[PDB]
Structure formats: C-alpha cells, structure tokens
Design a protein around this ligand. Sequence first.
Ligand SMILES: [Cl-]
Ligand SMILES: [Mg+2]
Lengths: 153, 151
Amino acid sequence: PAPNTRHQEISGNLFRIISTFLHGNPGSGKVFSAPTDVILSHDPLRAVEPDLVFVSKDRLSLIGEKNIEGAPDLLVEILSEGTEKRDRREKFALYERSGVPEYWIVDPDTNTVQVFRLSGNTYQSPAEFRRQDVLASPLLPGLSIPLSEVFPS
Amino acid sequence: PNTRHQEISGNLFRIISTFLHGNPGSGKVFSAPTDVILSHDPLRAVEPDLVFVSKDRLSLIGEKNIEGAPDLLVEILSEGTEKRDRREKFALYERSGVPEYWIVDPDTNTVQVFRLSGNTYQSPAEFRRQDVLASPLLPGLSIPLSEVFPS
Ligand SMILES: [Cl-]
Ligand SMILES: [Mg+2]
C-alpha cells in the first residue's frame, strides 16, 4: 500500500517549503518528491525511492531522462509504521557508503527529524530537531524550515 | 515516471500547495503516492499524480487512504500508458463522479480539463503553455503553465 495520509501531508509540507525556496532563488538546484528513482549503484543493484531528493546546481547532470544517477546532495526519508531497526540501519549504511552529503530521517510518530551530515567518509553524530525547532542546512543556506509547518497538528 | 514528469508534478504541487497554505480552510492537496479508493467491490484503487480534497470533503481522508471521489484528480501522461488504461481511468473517474479531472500532457505542454455536469464530463477545455490554468474549485489561484512545463 501507499504510505498513510499523514506521511504524505508531511512529505508535501516539506516539498512545498523547499520547492518554494528554490523557485524564488533560481540557480540553487532542484527538489523531487517520491516516486523518483535514485540509482546509487547498478551492480549489485541499489535503487532507492526516497520521499524527497535535492540536487544542487553543480550536480544537475545527475538528473537523467529516467532517474537520478548517483548520490544526490540531500535525501529525506520519512519513517513508516512498518520500518524495522535493520531497515533504518541498512538505508543509513547505504547512503553513508555512497557518500550522500546530508540525510534527514523524519519520524512522523514522534514529530522529530534526525539530521546526519557527512564529514570525511562517515556521518557525524545526528542533530535532532523537535516540532518547535527550525530546521536548516548549509546545503540550502537561506532556507528556514519551521517544523510546526511540517508536522500537522 | 521520468524526471521531467516528476518536475511537472512538483511544479503543479508547489503552486497548489502554496495557495492552500496561504488561504487556510480551502482544502488539502496530495501528491503520489496517495491511495484513492473509488470502489471496494470490485476493488478499484488509483494513485493519481495529484489529488485535491475541498474543505467540506476532508472527511474522505482516512488514516491510510482517501475513500471516495476527491474534488480534483490530476493525471500526468507517461510514455508507457496503454489506450485501455487511459480509457478506463477516464471512465472510472466519470462514473465515480469526480468533479474535475485534469490530464496533463508533457509531450505537448498542454492540460485538458474535464468538469462533471450531470452524470457526464463536458467537452474538455484545453490549456496551452502560454495560458493560465485555473479551476472554480480554487477561486483566486492562477497556475501559469510556463511555470509547470519546463523549457
Ligand atoms: Cl492508478
Ligand atoms: Mg510524490
């Protein structure tokens, strides 16, 4: 089945804020929402379907006709109710070894977001954002994401 | 779908969702993947590229999916769609009473707009890239199709 409806409203909130910002500041990259395929490797095949994918201006060439080919700048994952610890670990490990520079884990069930940022070859310790916090990334310098706008009441 | 398809979907979602955020009490918009259940026996479940639910119809939105005909359904033509698939979605939305149905063609940068009158859709209104797309379901919202179809 598709994700639940609140999962999709959280996703569209996030996409709305990031896409609005990119549109008013042309030349800052593009954002895509699921379903958008990201090919991190062809053999053994690792194709993922993140909820949101951001590609910086200097990486636009990753955007192929059919899918995104390589590690995007920011991947966003929204936890569903049927996610097991091993699924969280094996996505975190895949994005780390592919060198995805920033990874957001959004948890609808606790209204929190964990941010991981790559430093060298490994992710730094997660920074945690609660619903009352404002989320920002150096990848999107001039963007403030109030998480009260992301997590519906 | 291909990346230009998703860019088009995102462009439409950006415009509609921004409008609804700035005009609270006007409904909610969902993007794929969002399940819409138009029939339970026999089961007929679609994943439209975009789904709009008016404020009065927000009870259609359950925990898992949307049960019933939303006010607006947006389908973006993909290259792999078969004739029976396009025919049967049109027929399914028409008999379910979906009030407005947009078919977005990325290959011609056009949108075809069907609105329900009685039991049947009227003749379609065709919008080109140089036009403003709008719907009485969203009074006050201009969707310039030059911001929807990338150059
Ligand atoms: Cl479908
Ligand atoms: Mg989507």
